[PDB]
C-alpha cells in the first residue's frame, strides 16, 4: 500500500496562489522523488517538475519554472506544489507521483513514475455563488421526427452545480433530454434541457421548464412559447 494522499478541490480567483499537498504513506518519503503533473480538462498530461525529498533538489519544467514552487516537509512526509498568478488556463487536475521506477543503467539515469496520487482539482474563476439566467429555446422541428418539435430552456451562467430542470411540474417526462452542464472559462456553468413534443400541441398545450438552483435559492418557471 504505497499511497500518495492529495489535498482537496480548490476554487481560486484569478491572480491568487494555491498550494496543494501530497502526503506519502506506505513507504519512506525520502527514498524517492515526487513528480508533479497537471492535466487541463480534456487535455493530456503535462509534466511540471520533480523534487527529491531527501536533498530538496528540484527540477522545474521549462513551462512552469518561475511561477510554481515545489517544496517538501520531511517531518510530515508531505510535498507541496504552489501555483502563483493563477489564470483560467491554470484550471486543471494537479497530480503528484512517486518516482519508484529506478534506472536499470547509468546511461538512462532516470527515476520514472510508478504510483500516482488521485489528483487535486483546481478551478480558477471569478465566480461567486450565482443564480442562472433562464432563456427559452423556441420550438423547432428541423431535427426531430415527423410531426414533432423540440423546445427547450437555456440555463446560463450559474455556480456551483447542480441545476435541476423539470417540465410542467413533473407532469411531462416523455421526450425530455437535459444535457449535463458545460463548465466555461469564466468558471460558470451552463446547461440546456429540451423536450420533444407533438407539433399539433404547440397551440393548445403550455410548456414550462421548472429550473431550480438550490445553491443560490433561485427557482424559475420559464414558459416556452412557439
Amino acid at each position: 500500500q504505497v499511497q500518495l494522499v492529495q489535498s482537496g478541490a480548490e476554487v481560486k480567483k484569478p491572480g491568487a496562489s494555491v498550494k496543494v499537498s501530497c502526503k506519502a504513506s506506505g513507504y519512506t518519503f525520502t527514498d524517492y522523488h515526487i513528480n508533479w503533473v497537471r492535466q487541463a480538462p480534456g487535455q493530456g498530461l503535462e509534466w511540471m517538475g520533480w523534487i527529491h525529498p531527501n536533498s530538496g533538489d528540484t527540477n522545474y519544467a521549462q513551462k512552469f519554472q518561475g511561477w510554481v514552487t515545489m517544496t517538501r516537509d520531511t517531518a510530515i512526509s508531505t510535498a507541496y506544489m504552489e501555483v502563483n498568478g493563477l489564470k483560467s488556463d491554470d484550471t486543471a487536475v494537479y497530480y503528484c507521483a512517486r518516482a519508484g521506477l529506478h534506472p536499470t543503467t547509468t546511461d538512462y539515469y532516470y527515476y520514472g513514475m510508478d504510483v500516482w496520487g488521485q489528483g487535486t482539482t483546481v478551478t480558477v474563476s471569478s465566480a461567486s455563488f450565482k443564480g442562472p439566467s433562464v432563456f427559452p429555446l423556441a420550438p423547432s422541428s428541423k431535427s426531430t421526427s415527423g410531426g414533432t418539435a423540440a423546445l427547450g430552456c437555456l440555463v446560463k451562467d450559474y455556480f456551483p452545480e447542480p441545476v435541476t430542470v423539470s417540465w410542467n411540474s413533473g407532469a411531462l417526462t416523455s421526450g425530455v433530454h437535459t444535457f449535463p452542464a458545460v463548465l466555461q472559462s469564466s468558471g460558470l456553468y451552463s446547461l440546456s434541457s429540451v423536450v420533444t413534443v407533438p407539433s399539433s400541441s404547440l397551440g393548445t398545450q403550455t410548456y414550462i421548464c421548472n429550473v431550480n438552483h438550490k445553491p443560490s435559492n433561485t427557482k424559475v418557471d420559464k414558459k416556452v412559447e412557439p
Binding site: 513528480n35 498530461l45 521549462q62 532516470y110
Partner: protein, 210 residues
C-alpha cells in the same frame, strides 16, 4: 523532444490494440506506459519497454525499437477503454516527456450517427446584451465527437465551450456545445454554423439573425 501518439485507436472486443509512440532514437530510452480511465488518475501498465507491474494482465505488452515504441493489448475487453500515455525522459533537456495520449475505444455496439439540434440566441437574451448559440448533439456511438463553429465562411474559436460526451438512457452518447457572442457579433454576420464531426462524417446546422 516530442513523443508522437495517434489520437484515437478503435478495436472490437477480443481484438488486438496497438498504440504507437514515435520519437527520434526512442529505442535508446526506456518507455513507460500509463493507462488513464475516464475521470481517473493514471496507472502504470507497462514499464521498461516491455515489463508489466504486478496485477496487470499479461495481455498488456510493449515493445521498443528504432524510432517507435508500441503498446500492444491482446484480447481487448471493454474495461481496457481508456487514454494511454507513453512517457520518456529527455536527457538533453532534463525533461520528462509525455506522449499526447491515445484514446482506445472498445467498440461494444454498432456505430450510431449524431443528431444535431442548433438554437439561435433568444430575443430575451439579446435584450440582456448577450447572445448564446446552443448546439445539442445526441444518439451517437462511439462517444467521441469534435465540434467546430463557423461564422459566414470562416472558423470561430473564441467563445466556444463543448462538453465531453455522456451516456444516455439508451446507452448512446450526448454532448452539447455553446458559442457565446455579443449581440453585435450575432447581428453583423449572415449566419453561424455548428459543425459536428463523428467517425469521419460531419453534420452541420446553420442559424441566421433573420
Amino acid at each position: 523532444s516530442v513523443l508522437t501518439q495517434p489520437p484515437a485507436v478503435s478495436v472490437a472486443p477480443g481484438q488486438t490494440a496497438r498504440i504507437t509512440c514515435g520519437g527520434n532514437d526512442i529505442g535508446r530510452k526506456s518507455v513507460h506506459w500509463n493507462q488513464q480511465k475516464p475521470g481517473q488518475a493514471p496507472v502504470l501498465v507497462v514499464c521498461y519497454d516491455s515489463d508489466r507491474p504486478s496485477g496487470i494482465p499479461e495481455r498488456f505488452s510493449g515493445s521498443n525499437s528504432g524510432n517507435t515504441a508500441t503498446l500492444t493489448i491482446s484480447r481487448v475487453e471493454a474495461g481496457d477503454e481508456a487514454d494511454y500515455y507513453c512517457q520518456v525522459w529527455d536527457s538533453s533537456s532534463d525533461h520528462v516527456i509525455f506522449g499526447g495520449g491515445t484514446k482506445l475505444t472498445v467498440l461494444g455496439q454498432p456505430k450510431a450517427n449524431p443528431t444535431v439540434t442548433l438554437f439561435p440566441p433568444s430575443s430575451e437574451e439579446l435584450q440582456a446584451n448577450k447572445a448564446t448559440l446552443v448546439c445539442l448533439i445526441s444518439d451517437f456511438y462511439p462517444g467521441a465527437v469534435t465540434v467546430a463553429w463557423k461564422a459566414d465562411s470562416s472558423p470561430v474559436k473564441a467563445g466556444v465551450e463543448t462538453t465531453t460526451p455522456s451516456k444516455q438512457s439508451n446507452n448512446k452518447y450526448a454532448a452539447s456545445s455553446y458559442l457565446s457572442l455579443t449581440p453585435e457579433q450575432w447581428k453583423s454576420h449572415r449566419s453561424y454554423s455548428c459543425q459536428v464531426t463523428h467517425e469521419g462524417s460531419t453534420v452541420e446546422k446553420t442559424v441566421a439573425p433573420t
